[PDB]
Structure formats: C-alpha cells, structure tokens
C-alpha cells in the first residue's frame, strides 16, 4: 500500500544519524583543513547532539497546534539547507555552529514524526513497524563510522553533506505525498501559558510518568555501555580496537534480533505479554553481567554476553512500552512524545554521569551493579504500569 510514510520517515531518521556517525571519522581531517586544534574534534559531536536536545520541547506541541505535516516537512528542509550551508563555513567556528543548527533536525523525529506513526497505525501493526524501522536506523551507528572511514580516503569529506541532503530530498517528496496528518488540535492558539498548562497535565498522570521513566531506566544500561566501553575495554582491560568493536557485535546484534522477533510476534501475542517476554532476558542478562563481574572483577566476556542477553529483551519490549506509555495519557501526542523524550534525555544525562563515576571508584562490578538496579526500577515500574 501507500505505507511509505514509515519507509520515508526512517530514511530521514537514518539521514540525521549518519550526519554524526559518518562525520566523526573525518573530524581530524576536518579540523586540519580549518587549521584548528585537535580539541575541536569532539565538539562536532557535542554540537550535533546538543542540537537534537534543543527544540524538542516546542516542536511537539507546535505540531499539535498547526499539524504534524507542516512541522515535520519543515524540519526536513531545515536539515537539507543546513547540510548544504556547511559548505559555506569558512572557519572552524562557523563549522561548529552549523553542526549545531543541523542537530536541530533530530528533534523533529521523536516529537513529530514518530508521534504520527503511533497515531496513524493500529497497535500491533505500529509495533511491527516501529520495531523494524528501528533496525534500519541502527544501520547508521553500526556502519556509519566504518563507511565514514572509507569515504574520506577516496572522496572529499564535504561530499557527505551532499549525500545527506540527497537522501533527505528523496525523503521529503515521500513524506510530502504520504505522511498522514494526525494532529487533533489544529488551529489552536500557542502561548507559553497554555503550553505550560499542557505539560503540567501530563506530569500529573502518574501512570504515564511511570512508563516514560521505565523507558529511560531500562535503556540506560545500554547507553552506559556505549559511553564507556572504549574506556572499560581498551584503556581498562588492554584490548585492541578490533576486539573492542568486536564486543559491540553481540550486543547490538542482539538488539536487532529483539526487534525482529518482536515484529514477528506482534500478531501472535498481546503487547502486555511481549513486554513480559522481553522482561526475562532484561533481568537475566543484567544479573549475568552483575553477578559474574562481582565474582570476577575482569570478566569482560560475561559482561558482554550478559549485556547481549539484556539487549535482546529491550528489542522485544521497547516498541511495545513506547506505544503503551504514549497512549497512557489523553494529551496530544506531540506534547506526550516530547515529554517522553525529555524524561528519557534527563535519565540518560544524569544516569551516565553516575555510571562513569560508578566505574572509577569500583570496577566493572559497580558499573554492572548500577546497571542492575535500573533494571529493577524498570521491573518495579512495570508492576505499577501494567496494573
């Protein structure tokens, strides 16, 4: 059918992800052409990801007031223009600014686009769709950095930003004629007063809040691994860059399987049972990683296999719990999705910083013990969330 709105949404989603995943490999080549210090290399990832955290709060509720089509389609244009605008950046400081202005194109995805995917499709169909397009998005973190490395040696790095606008221009025309309008509040007045009243209403909904936090706590052990596996494996266990990137394969490969299995089970199990089916690998895997590293302070393979089992349960559970939590409140979904994302951004910002200091004054055991209580929190929040 004409369900390419999922297909073209993930194309745009994938395009914003390679806007950072494929660029960091060449950031040393970037900062050398601009004749700037090597301390400007990490700030391009810092500027890009800080842009995604910027207009999350407004884009959602704005899309309720004037529609999910005009807001989303505008962000696709913003992404395309700022992708090409960086080719006029004459110095490194202009480059970093445009890195951040491109980064604002990411908060159109959660608050606006995926709100439409959830409102448009039925429960079991939408979970098959969100779980499978999540795998197509994971192609960017998995293959982006490796493709970005091959790109800079044969082609100019500036040609990546042309590639991003080209994929998003394909996505724009697809989204144009396919993206459904699901905003109920079209034509409403927008002021900071009413916008504040909207978020106070959703934070009163304890059931919604309990589910949005559970999405943050259960996904935090995965981000704590991404943010610190270079330090834990390489500088801590003295393993090669090959064997570090190799230990990412069983974890991120299990995440894809959890989505692939969830997708196939969408029609054969209730969303309540899919979350519980995913909850068993989540606690088992976190316990495998937690118990084995308290016994063996340097059992990094048990940690890798433990987090892989746990990563399999997330693919099974997430897309379902995302749906239930979103519709657990009668608020417009732009405001709800934005609230969900900010509640998760908060858990990840504060959470990762604790896990960094958890691994310092206490080895892999404390890093894995901190991961286990987050799984206990999720478990305890699901007991409150499911009845």
């Amino acid at each position, epitope marked *: 059918q*004409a*369900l390419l709105f999922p297909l073209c949404l993930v194309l745009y989603e994938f395009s914003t992800y390679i806007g950072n995943d494929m660029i960091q490999p060449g950031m040393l080549a970037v900062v050398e052409q601009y004749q700037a210090g090597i301390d400007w290399v990490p700030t391009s990832m810092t500027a890009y990801l800080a842009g995604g955290m910027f207009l999350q709060w407004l884009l959602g509720p704005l899309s309720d007031r004037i529609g999910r089509r005009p807001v989303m389609l505008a962000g696709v244009v913003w992404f395309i223009v700022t992708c090409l605008a960086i080719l006029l950046a004459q110095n490194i400081e202009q480059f970093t600014l445009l890195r951040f202005l491109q980064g604002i194109s990411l908060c159109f995805i959660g608050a606006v686009g995926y709100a439409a995917i959830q409102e*448009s499709f*039925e429960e079991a169909v939408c979970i098959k769709i969100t779980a499978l397009m999540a795998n197509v998005a994971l192609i960017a973190p998995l293959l982006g950095p490796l493709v970005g490395a091959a790109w800079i040696h044969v082609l100019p790095w500036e040609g990546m930003f042309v590639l991003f606008a080209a994929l998003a221009a394909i996505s724009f025309f697809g989204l144009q004629r396919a993206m*459904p309008e699901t905003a*109920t*509040r*079209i034509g409403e007045k927008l002021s900071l007063k009413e916008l504040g009243r909207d978020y106070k209403l959703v934070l009163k909904n304890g059931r919604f809040v309990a589910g949005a936090l559970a999405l943050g706590f259960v996904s935090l052990p995965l981000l704590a691994w991404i943010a610190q596996s270079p330090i834990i494996i390489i500088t801590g266990e003295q393993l090669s860059s090959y064997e570090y990137g190799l230990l990412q394969v069983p974890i991120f490969g299990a995440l894809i399987a959890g989505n692939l299995l969830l997708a196939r089970l969408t029609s054969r199990r209730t969303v309540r049972s899919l979350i519980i089916m995913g909850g068993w690998p989540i606690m088992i895997g976190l316990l495998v990683a937690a118990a084995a590293t308290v016994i063996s302070s340097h059992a990094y393979l048990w940690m890798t296999a433990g987090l892989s089992i746990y990563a399999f349960g997330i693919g099974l559970a997430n897309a379902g719990l995302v749906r239930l939590t979103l519709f657990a409140s*009668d608020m417009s979904k732009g405001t709800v999705s934005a609230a969900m994302g900010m509640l998760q951004m908060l858990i990840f910002t504060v959470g990762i910083e604790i896990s960094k200091h958890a691994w310092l004054n206490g080895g892999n055991g404390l890093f894995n013990l901190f991961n286990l209580v987050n799984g206990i929190l999720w478990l305890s929040l699901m007991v409150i969330f499911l009845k």
Partner: antibody
C-alpha cells in the same frame, strides 16, 4: 465524498455503507461516520486515521467496524445486529489540513424495518 | 463521554440582529471545538474550527468565542440564509460528541 448505502435492512441484520473519498490525499486525512436519527440530532459514530487505527463510540463499540480499501480508495462502515434505533441519515465526514470534520458527505438514508 | 448541552434550544429573531448560541461542556475541552450548520435539505457545512477560526469562505458576520466552560457563536447582522440548524462539536476526548442543536426561525 459519496456514501453508497443499502437503504433498507432488517433488525438483527448487517449493513455496509461505503464512502468513496474525493482527492488524491485519501490515506492522509482521517475519516469519520456521523448519523442523524429522524429527530434526535447528530451522533458521532467512529473514525479511522489513515493508517488504519480505529476509534469508535463506546456505546456502539460492540457492533461498529470501520475499515479502508487502499485499492478502491474508499472506507466502509459495517454495523451488526440492527434495530429501530439505527434508522438514521448516515454522513461521511473527513479531516483536513484545518482540523477535524472539515468536509462532509452527502448522506445516505438507511432504514431498519421489515 | 463529555456531554455537550447546547442552548438556546431554539431561537427566533428578525434580520440584521445580533444573536448568540452557546455550548457548555461537561468538563474541560480547552479550545477544541467546532461549529456546524445544517442547511434545510440536510447539507452539513462547517463554519468555525478550533473555537475561533472561521473556515475559508464563510461570511464575516460569524464569530466564535470562549468564556470558561461556555463557548458561543454570534451572527452580527443575520441574513435570510442564516436561519437553519446549528450544532457544536467537541473533539477533546474520544468519543467526539455533538450538541443538542439549535434551530433558527424568522421574525415574530
């Protein structure tokens, strides 16, 4: 919007009103069903959201069923176990870029007797 | 269900007169409200969406408003064609609900 209906049906039978949607943007905007009993004003029945997600009225959520046909560009209202109550003029409303129920259907007079 | 009681149930007035409708809500519906007129033959036409916004192609005499739970619709200078049925529609929470209507008649 043109809604083909049966016109006459019997109690404890099924009906099927098929509304054909004008415009290429068929699977973009949602579609509603509204009925008007001979005297008792207007009643909102249900809604389908373009991707198939259905939303029914709680009192009649028991017999209502709203489905689309991507090939023939039309939406159906299928209602089960009828009676005197459900004799009404059934309308086919449609969302738009300016909110809900911006364009309405002609209406088809469906009757339930013997 | 958010019940929507519409008043006056019926109303009569001569041409060029400023008259108003009103739908009170069972609970808070915000600004999510529509106004629909039904021509005598049955043609339903939407005039105002989201409390205040006139739809494209509607005479300037129409204008909707909100004051608390009470949402009104006023015609400044009534005309001959305006004497029809009028319903309001709430789309804040499912199921959407209509008002009790108001049928408009001419003069005295």
């Amino acid at each position: 919007l043109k809604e083909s209906g049966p016109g006459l049906v019997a109690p404890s039978q099924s009906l099927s009103i098929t509304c054909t949607v004008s415009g290429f943007s068929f699977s973009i905007y949602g579609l509603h069903w509204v009925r008007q009993p001979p005297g008792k004003g207007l009643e909102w029945l249900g809604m389908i959201w373009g991707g198939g997600r259905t939303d029914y009225n709680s009192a009649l959520k028991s017999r209502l069923s709203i489905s689309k046909d991507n090939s023939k560009s039309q939406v159906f209202l299928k209602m089960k176990s009828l009676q005197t109550d459900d004799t009404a003029m059934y309308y086919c409303a449609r969302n738009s870029g300016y909110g809900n129920l911006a364009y309405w259907g002609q209406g088809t007079l469906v009757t339930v007797s013997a | 269900d958010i019940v929507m009681t519409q008043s006056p149930s019926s109303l009569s007035a001569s041409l060029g007169e400023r008259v108003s409708l009103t739908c009170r809500a069972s609970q808070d519906i915000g600004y999510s409200l529509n106004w629909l007129q039904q021509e005598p033959d049955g043609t339903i036409k939407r005039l105002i969406y989201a409390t205040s916004n006139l739809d494209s192609g509607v005479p300037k005499r129409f204008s909707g408003s909100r004051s608390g739970s009470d949402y009104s619709l006023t015609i400044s200078s009534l005309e001959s064609e305006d004497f029809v049925d009028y319903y309001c529609l709430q789309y804040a929470s499912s199921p959407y609900t209509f008002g009790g209507g108001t049928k408009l008649e001419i003069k005295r």
